[PDB]
Each structure stands twice: as C-alpha cells, then as structure tokens.
Amino acid sequence: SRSLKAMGEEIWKNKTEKINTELFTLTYGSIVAQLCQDYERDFNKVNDHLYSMGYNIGCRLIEDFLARTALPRCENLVKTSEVLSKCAFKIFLNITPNITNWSHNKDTFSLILDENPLADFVELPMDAMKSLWYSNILCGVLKGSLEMVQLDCDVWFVSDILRGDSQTEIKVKLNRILKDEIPIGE
Amino acid sequence: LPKVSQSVYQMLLNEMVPLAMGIERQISRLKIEEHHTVDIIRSHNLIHELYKADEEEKEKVLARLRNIGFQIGLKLSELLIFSNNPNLKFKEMDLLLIMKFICRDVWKQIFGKQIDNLKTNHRGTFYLLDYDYRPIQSFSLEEDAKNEELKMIEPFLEIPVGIIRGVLSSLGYSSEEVICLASFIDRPTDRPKTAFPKGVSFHVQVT
Amino acid sequence: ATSGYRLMDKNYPNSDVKYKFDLLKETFVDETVFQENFLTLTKEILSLFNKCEGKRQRIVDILSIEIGLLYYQGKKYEEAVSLFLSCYEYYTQTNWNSIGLKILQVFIDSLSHCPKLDVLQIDGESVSASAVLTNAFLNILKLCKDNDSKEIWWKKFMDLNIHLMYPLDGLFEVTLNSKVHLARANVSAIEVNLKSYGFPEDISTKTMRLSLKNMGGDVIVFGASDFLLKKGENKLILECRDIMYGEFSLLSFEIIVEGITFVKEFPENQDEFIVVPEIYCKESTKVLVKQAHNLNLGEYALELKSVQSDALESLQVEVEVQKNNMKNLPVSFSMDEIQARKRYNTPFENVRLEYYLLDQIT
Amino acid sequence: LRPCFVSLIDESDKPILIYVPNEMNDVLKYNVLSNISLDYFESALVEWHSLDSKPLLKSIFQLEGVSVFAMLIKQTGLKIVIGFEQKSLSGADDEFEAINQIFETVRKIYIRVKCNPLLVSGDEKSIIKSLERKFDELFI
Ligand SMILES: *C(=O)CCCCCCCCCCCCCCC
C-alpha cells in the first residue's frame, strides 16, 4: 500500500494519544531505582529482571502494534529489520534506529539508538559503570514481541552511551523461525 | 516538545504490581536468554497471587509499591514547578491551593483527564474524587465474579497514593504528618456508565 | 589602596587605577590608630545591627568574628579567646567548613600562644582549658580535608587529662567482614576492618572492644589490646574470652587511645543480628551438664563432666535454675530448704549433683 | 561573564554547594559573602517579586568589590547566589538578561541532577560530585 516510513509517519502524526517523554523517563527511572535499591545493588540480576519486564510488556504490546499497523507476518530478517526500524519504534517511542553490522548470510544485525528516550538524563555511579545496562527493557520487549510473530531471536546489548561507549547497539540475532501448529487427532 | 505514545506508558505503569510481587518472591516458565536459563512467571498469575498470598506479604508489597509512587511524585513535582510555576509558597499558606495545583496539573500530566470535584472540611482531611480512573478502564474477571474483581484491583490503587504523597513532599510537609488512603467507596452518581463500574476516592489527611 | 596596610586577609581586585584618598589623612596617619579606628566603626555597626530584633543575626556573628580576628592581629589574645567562646564550634554543624576552619584554627593558635590560660567558662561550669583545646583540635582534624598537610596540627599537639568521649563517626568507619570463628582453645574470634581516613599518622591504641547485646539484655565484649593502627585500610581479629551462644545484635565499637575514647553507638533494631555458634575443638576446656545415666526410681540427679580438665589453676562453676506460671521454682538442691544455686570451687573430673523435683515439671 | 562563586542553599539554611571555578583563601571570602547574603532574603529591607509567579533576580549588595546577585525559588525554598567581579560589568540591560539566563541554566542543572533516578535518597556526596562536574563542564 505505502512505504513503511510513510506508514509510520502517518500513524504517529494523527492516530495516537501522546504523553511527555520526561514523565516516561521519570517512571522508568523510578522502576530501575527501586530495583537497584532492594537488590542490594547486585547489578548482575537486575538486568535479568528488567529482561523479564521487557518480555512481559512487549508480549502484550505486539498485539497493539499489529492491530494498529495490520502488517503481514514477517519471514526474513531483511524485511523484519525494515519493519522494526522504520515503523515500530516510530509509533511508540518516536525514534528511528539505524541498521548496521549486517552479519554474513544476513543472519544478524544491530540497532543503533541515536537517541534513547529511556535515558534522557542519567548518570550511573561508578558501581554500575561497567555492570549495568539500564535499557534491558528495550531488548526484552524486542524478544517478547518477536517471539509472537513466530520467530525465536537472541537479542542482547553490545554497548551503551551511559557506560561510556561510542554508541548504543543492540544485536538482534535470530536462532530459528519456528513453524505453525496443526491439530491432529488419534 | 517531544512526546511518547500514551499506550506504552500506560502499559508500563500498569506493570508494577507484577513487578511488586515478582521482586518480593525473588527476594524471599524457563527459557535461555543467550547462555543461562532465566525464570519468568506470567504477569496475570502474579496479580492473582497477590490476591491470595498472605496478609503480611500483601502489606510489604503495598509498601514497596507506595515507595515507587512516592519516587514518581518526588521526581515529578520539581519538574512541574519549574515548568508551570504555580502561585504556591513553600510550607503552608493554605492546603486548598496545594490541592488545586495537584488536581489542575499533576493529573493532567499523568492521566488524560482532570480529576473531578473535591470535598473540603476546611480544617482537616480532603477527599479527591475521580470517576472511571483511566489506568484500570479495561480490567475485569467474569460476568458474575464482581467482589473478586474489586478485591483484585486494590494494589493497583497505590500508584496515585504514592504520587500524591510524593507531591506533598518536596512542598513542605514530610511523610510523617500526611496519611492518604484510596478506596472504591465512590459511586457513578450521574455520569455515563463506562466499562469499570466504580469510581475512586483518595482520603488524604494532613496536619 | 594608597598605603597597603593589610587587614587580616581581605584583599580587593588589584586595579592599576589609583585613587588620591588624601584629604582624610588624619585617622590613619600612623599604622597603629588605623586598627582601633576600624574597630570603632565595626563596633558601631555591630551595635546598630544588634538593635534590629533578631531578624538579622548572621551578619552580627560575621562582624563579631571579624572583631576577633582583628584582636588576633593586634596580639591581645586574652579578649580574642573569650570572644570566640560564644561561637566556639557553631560554624561546623551547618556546613560552613572554611568559616569553621578559619575561626577554630585562630582560636587554637590563640590558646596555644599565651602562658597561663588555666581555666575558662563558656555558658556555665568552668571548663578546663586543655579539655576544650583538645576538643577543638580533634574537631579540626575531621574538619580539615587536605590528606597529607594536616600533619602540622598533629606535630603541634603531640609535643603539647580527663577521660573524654567523642562521636567517633567522621574519623573512623567500621564494617563487619565475615563473622565469628574459633581461633584458639576457648576464645571466639571475629575479624573486622576499620579505615582511618581522619588522622594522618599511625595510632598506638591501648584497648579495642566490640560489644554484642543479646535479646535478653546481657552483653559480650570482643577484645584486642595494644594494636598499632596503620594509616589506611587494616584488618584485625577481636578475641572474646567469656562467650555466650545464640542470636546477638551489635551494640557499639570503642577505641581507647591514651587519654581519649572514641565511641560509635550503632542504631537499634536493624534485623542484622549475628549468631555466635559453638565450635568444637579437641584442645578446649569445657564443662558438660546433663541428666545422670544410672539412677534409682524417684531419685533424680545430674552429672557434671569436665572434658579436657587436666591441669587448671582454678575455676568457679555455678549452676542456677530459672523459674518457669512465672512464680514457681520447680526444682531444689536441698530436701529441707529451697535453694536455686550450686557453687563448686575445686577442679573435678566427674561429680554427681543432687535433685529434688518440686511439683510436676517434666 | 565568568561568575566568581555559585552558592545553592535550601529551605533549612543547609549549603548544598559553594563551588568556586578555580589564589587560595578566596574560598573563605566567598563563604563569608554567601553567609552574609543568606540572611538578606527574609528581610523587609528588600521587596521580593511576588508578581505574576515568576522568579525575579535582584542585586542584593556589594562587599569586598564583588557584585553579588541572588534569586529565590518561592515554591521550593531553594536559594541561588552568584558573584561577579566589578571590573567585568558594564551595567547594561542585555548583561542583566544574560545573568538571568545564567541563573536559569544553573537552576536547570540543579533540577536535572536532583531528579537523577540513581540518587539513593539523600547522599549529598553524589550530588556535590555531579553538580561539580557539570559546573566544570559549563564554566570553562
Ligand atoms: C514482523 O511482523 C515483525 C514486527 C516487528 C517487531 C515488533 C516490535 C515492537 C516493539 C518495539 C519497541 C517498543 C518500545 C518498548 C520500550 C517501552
């Protein structure tokens, strides 16, 4: 019907309610703050628990995304990349991550977050300078949502601007495209 | 100024009671992330667990969630004061101005609708009355299970209690002379009937 | 600008432009009269400000300390020290660190200069000059954060007595590393670490005691005597000779340096209680109490055994019962009277202690 | 315009931070000036803004050849005090607006640091470090 970029811009313009980014930052920061507080700053497992958060929320969010866009099922990483680059992030967080690091045989790629609205202003302590990610909810959402389009994916963080690296990257390697089910009867 | 889709924000805000139980169960389904197996338990199961867990577990989880809401209010209030700049003073001219500021600004910028009329004893406690309470407009169990429905929602009502408690903090009064309690005693008096049947009331007292 | 006579330390931005401030060359013709002219002006300002109720009080204190510093510059320290007694320590709780450093440094120097300075009074009972001087000294130690250049005050005071407490916090901080474990025959040991970031030099302590309080109320002390604290992070073992077993809550930690005692009283009800278990060692004198093995019907008794008895200079072992009904003593070590205690004094290998059941207790 | 010192004080007269953007004993002079300026707020001598609900800058006094201005945050009780050299001021309206802009930037930095969602509850050392590095980034 239309290009993915045009679809994303059109739906974001006049087909969605809106809320201030700063409030979203405060909410997510308070969540991470409480997680940090009551785990005794054991930052190895807060990552996993935020991953569980992301899986849970994105596994519902995929229904809203598909109900809005009504796209067909994705089949290969080439078109999936186009989708979650140029519509899916635009509808929700109003950003357009770039695609780079195309691995061999088009197996994996990486999302470069030019702007992360989850960390608009953040300064981690020295304890978390090389232990915490603070954005595990994003890749958790990605894994949870892509699980529901019938494709299993391994997604994790490579770098983050908060930790001091040059850019924030999320490798979204695919493991196997699981097939549909069938109801036999014996 | 930049914005985010309201749906994802609402879903994140709702997914705190599942946090509030998952975290506590971790202190006191399985899948491999990349090399190590992490355990995840579904969000809808944890709310049912909170309904039927314990009297002392529930109090701990509610206190934790109130602390979360307190952080929301504490961080949010300074930003609203810098942005909108109300005609308040620090400690106390009158509580009516403070509550008017909360109603006119905080609930605008958190939820999509101004909070409705509020009672006033002029001496002690104030009642903040909201009809249909946006973040639970699509919560239900069954056609017949109505008491179970209401008793299953109550932990979700700690987010605004914490928000109000935080907003009162950093504005004079600390969290020792302020007590706030949410309840479902409100009625749908004459408004059009929405999905959820019962309103929300915040009995908030200061001294 | 025209003369250059410095007033304490306050200097202005040195501008090349000069001012011919010559017509009033009557009140500062010499160097001496200038100081008391400034003092007169400042006193007039102080009197006017002090007649403004209590709505303007900070500038009053600033002007008073300015008067004190001028007195210090004039070398008439007897008035200066008395003037500083009012705000002796005031500018240290409110986080005005440079102000406190300046005022308290000049106070200590003034006290150290004059010959006698035997006795002083601040708001009541006449406090000893040395007793307040050491308080001020120990205050500048924690107040002055300059790492290595605080050694000047240390060298000033070592060459320079009342058993005197202080709030240890701000000088030392201690945390519990690991927990209790047997170290020798009958002494339970616990290792701890204390960081000495306050003082610059090593400390020759005299006694170190860590107190653990039971839920009942009684306490046990883990001791360590004559330990030389090094400048930095150091670990040490605290030994307790007389121990009790069960849950225990930390109470306080005490440093006893020669003349002073630094105490750090912990908060209450932390729910971080540590447990003092029994550790069995083959070479450890102990006494075992239990019901007797061989006995007649209706003839109760106890058996006391002394494992690793061997040679012992002396020992006093006492056994006393507790009442249950909270007003019944359901056992007696005598057929006629009602006793609740036995007191052995001499060494033994095995003895038989009598028993007389009172009513029904099992 | 390079300020001489920047002081932040809360409702309880607790100085958060009196950063000086680095001679040695000028910090004492600036701390004395901040202490003198602290009591100047609650005084009938100066009429504060109390008009249209906007923070208002004021020239509070001149001691030791240091033009020092201050702003009061009515809603929070925060107090900002900023000093300047006499020889660096031309007394122009645009300069007044620039000083107001500097005050606004300092307030924004303070809010951003305070609303950081990793401050535990009240750890003052972290606030001092963060504000100090931010002020180093700005005033340079
Ligand atoms: C083919 O249908 C693939 C569809 C693309 C995957 C769906 C991506 C949805 C999640 C995007 C991230 C939203 C923000 C989450 C953080 C709150």
UniProtKB/Swiss-Prot annotation, chain A:
Annotated transmembrane regions: none
Xref: Pfam families: TRAPP
A GO cellular component entry from the record: cis-Golgi network membrane
SUPFAM superfamilies hit by this protein: Ligand-binding domain in the NO signalling and Golgi transport (SSF111126)
Impact noted for substituting residue 74 to S: Loss of palmitoylation
Matches recorded under CDD domains: TRAPPC3_bet3
Keywords: Autophagy, Endoplasmic reticulum, ER-Golgi transport, Golgi apparatus, Lipoprotein, Palmitate, Transport
Keyword Magnesium: no
GO biological process: cellular response to nitrogen starvation; cytoplasm to vacuole targeting by the Cvt pathway; endoplasmic reticulum to Golgi vesicle-mediated transport; intra-Golgi vesicle-mediated transport; macroautophagy; retrograde transport, endosome to Golgi
Domain of life: Eukaryota
Record family assignment: Belongs to the TRAPP small subunits family. BET3 subfamily.
PANTHER family: TRAFFICKING PROTEIN PARTICLE COMPLEX SUBUNIT 3 (PTHR13048)
Additional remarks: Present with 2370 molecules/cell in log phase SD medium.
Entry protein name: Trafficking protein particle complex subunit BET3
Origin species: Saccharomyces cerevisiae (strain ATCC 204508 / S288c) (Baker's yeast)
Source organism phylogeny: Eukaryota, Fungi, Dikarya, Ascomycota, Saccharomycotina
Swiss-Prot record, chain B:
Key words of the record: Acetylation, Autophagy, Endoplasmic reticulum, ER-Golgi transport, Golgi apparatus, Transport
Locations listed in the record: Golgi apparatus, cis-Golgi network; Endoplasmic reticulum; Preautophagosomal structure
SUPFAM superfamilies noted in UniProt: Ligand-binding domain in the NO signalling and Golgi transport
Family: Belongs to the TRAPP small subunits family. BET3 subfamily.
Provenance organism: Saccharomyces cerevisiae (strain ATCC 204508 / S288c) (Baker's yeast)
Principal cellular location given in the protein's record: Golgi
GO biological process: endoplasmic reticulum to Golgi vesicle-mediated transport; intra-Golgi vesicle-mediated transport; macroautophagy; positive regulation of macroautophagy; protein localization to phagophore assembly site; protein-containing complex assembly; protein-containing complex localization; retrograde transport, endosome to Golgi
Protein name stated in the entry: Trafficking protein particle complex subunit 33
UniProt-listed Pfam families: TRAPP
UniProt xrefs under InterPro entries: NO_sig/Golgi_transp_ligand-bd (IPR024096), TRAPP_component (IPR007194), TRAPPC6/Trs33 (IPR037992)
Task performed by this protein: Component of the TRAPP I, TRAPP II and TRAPP III complexes which act as guanine nucleotide exchange factors (GEF) for YPT1. TRAPP I plays a key role in the late stages of endoplasmic reticulum to Golgi traffic. TRAPP II plays a role in intra-Golgi transport. TRAPP III plays a role in autophagosome formation. Required for sporulation. Has a role late in meiosis following DNA replication.
Keyword Acyltransferase: no
Curated annotation (Swiss-Prot), chain C:
Lineage: Eukaryota, Fungi, Dikarya, Ascomycota, Saccharomycotina
Description of how the protein assembles with itself and partners: Part of the multisubunit TRAPP (transport protein particle) II complex composed of BET3, BET5, TRS20, TRS23, TRS31, TRS33, TRS65, TRS120 and TRS130. Interacts with YPT31 and YPT32.
Major subcellular location class: Golgi
Leader peptide range in chain numbering: none
Residues of the full protein shown: 369 to 736 of 1102
Keyword set includes Transport: yes
Listed GO biological process terms: cytoplasm to vacuole targeting by the Cvt pathway; early endosome to Golgi transport; intra-Golgi vesicle-mediated transport; macroautophagy; retrograde transport, endosome to Golgi
S-S pairs: none
The entry's keywords: Autophagy, Golgi apparatus, Transport
Note: Present with 432 molecules/cell in log phase SD medium.
Location(s), subcellular: Golgi apparatus
Family per similarity comment: Belongs to the TMEM1 family.
Gene Ontology CC terms: cytosol; early endosome; trans-Golgi network; TRAPPII protein complex
Purpose: Specific subunit of the TRAPP II complex, a highly conserved vesicle tethering complex that functions in the late Golgi as a guanine nucleotide exchange factor (GEF) for the Golgi YPT1 GTPase. TRS130 plays a role in the YPT GEF activity of TRAPP II in concert with the two other TRAPP II-specific subunits TRS65 and TRS120. Required for both the cytoplasm-to-vacuole targeting (Cvt) pathway and starvation-induced autophagy through its role in ATG8 and ATG9 trafficking.
Identification of the protein by name: Trafficking protein particle complex II-specific subunit 130
Domain of life of the source: Eukaryota
Curated annotation (Swiss-Prot), chain D:
Gene Ontology terms: cellular component: cytoplasm; cytosol; Golgi apparatus; nucleus; TRAPP complex; TRAPPII protein complex
Name of this protein: TRAPP-associated protein TCA17
The keyword Phosphoprotein belongs to this UniProt entry's keyword annotation: no
UniProt similarity note: Belongs to the TRAPP small subunits family. Sedlin subfamily.
Subunit note: Interacts with the TRAPP II complex; TRAPP II subunits TRS33 and TRS65 are required for this interaction.
Keywords from the UniProt entry: Golgi apparatus
Disulfide bonds: none
Other remarks in the entry: Present with 8660 molecules/cell in log phase SD medium.
Subcellular location: Golgi apparatus, trans-Golgi network
Function (record text): Required, together with the TRAPP II subunit TRS33, for TRAPP II complex assembly or stability, and for proper Golgi localization of TRAPP and the Rab GTPase YPT31.
Highest taxon of the lineage: Eukaryota
Signal peptide: none
Biological process (GO), any one: protein-containing complex assembly
